[PDB]
């Protein structure tokens, strides 16, 4: 089980997550749900996520990322999940 830091927790809650403690599988699930709630993926190139000007981009340190190269996402999670 992991406990997200507050900015990441707010993202998960905005996507429908409840509580403070999660499995990594649950964190990944609600990050995907957040990207869809905020409509951050490109409808015409659906592996591309454009997160500039969103809190998610601020945590990632990126304007965009691809689901085919999730390395910046994993770097963020390592920094923002307390295990």
């Amino acid at each position: 089980q992991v406990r997200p830091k507050l900015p990441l927790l707010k993202i998960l809650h905005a996507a429908g997550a409840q509580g403070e403690m999660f499995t990594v599988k649950e964190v990944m699930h609600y990050l995907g749900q957040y990207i869809m709630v905020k409509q951050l993926y490109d409808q015409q190139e659906q592996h591309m996520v454009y997160c500039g000007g969103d809190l998610l981009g601020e945590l990632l340190g990126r304007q965009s990322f691809s689901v085919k190269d999730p390395s910046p996402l994993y770097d963020m999670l390592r920094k923002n999940l307390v295990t």
């Binding site: 990944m28 995907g32 869809m36 993926y41 659906q46 592996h47 689901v67 085919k68 999730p70």
Partner: peptide, 8 residues
């Protein structure tokens, strides 16, 4: 999107 995301 979800087809790709759930494949991680």
């Amino acid at each position: 999107f979800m087809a790709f995301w759930e494949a991680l």
